[PDB]
Amino acid sequence: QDRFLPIANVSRIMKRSLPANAKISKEAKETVQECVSEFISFVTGEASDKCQREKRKTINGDDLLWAMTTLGFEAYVGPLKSYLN
Amino acid sequence: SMDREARVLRYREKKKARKFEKTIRYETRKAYAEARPRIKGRFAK
Amino acid sequence: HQLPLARIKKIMKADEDVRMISAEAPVLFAKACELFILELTIRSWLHAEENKRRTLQRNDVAAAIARTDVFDFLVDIVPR
DNA sequence: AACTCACTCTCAACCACAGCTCGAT
DNA sequence: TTATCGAGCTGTGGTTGAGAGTGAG
Incomplete structure (x- = not known):
């Protein structure tokens, strides 16, 4: 669907996130x-x-980080801030 | 929690309202863009 | 770098409430998606590993979604 | 079954700037 | 307490090549 992020980009990222020997079903992607x-x-x-x-x-970027914090994603906030610089 | 359930439900109801058609919201900015010099599609002076 | 910002922006702008988006927001979002994809994928992998499998399957992703509170909003997406 | 990788052709990124946005005041 | 206002910032859209999509092996 054209409302989603492109599946090749998503698939690449899950692949790099896993041990080299892992396989990912088309359904999982x-x-x-x-x-x-x-x-x-x-x-x-x-x-x-x-x-x-x-x-x-x-x-703006702070609005996103506030939203992520109140939705359970505080763990991302640190890395994110550090990534902007 | 009770607060999460509110935001999650609001997220689900906002779902039915997603509008993916190209909507234009700064109709002035279209005008200037529509009639603006372009090198190979890119804007230029 | 990885995910295309235009498509991030397009999903954002499907919400009728959003008006302007700052230049860095899709940049931040693309990184946040990589952290999200990583966590969801590794937790799915865990389930596959626990079932003595190397191919992550859909039910592994579902397992990860049920077990992880942060992923609670996606619970109705798995089942069709 | 998923992965490979060469091939097709889609579509994200690029640009300038008028005048709206928003925090130091 | 709420309001101001100029230094900065962002929406807009044709074009096209970088890379998404594809499938036989």
């Missing part, structure tokens, strides 16, 4: 493609809400 795509939606809606409450029109 399609399931994870949807999931990471939904991750973007999920987080964006919380960031989008924050901006509404605070009456701004731009979703």
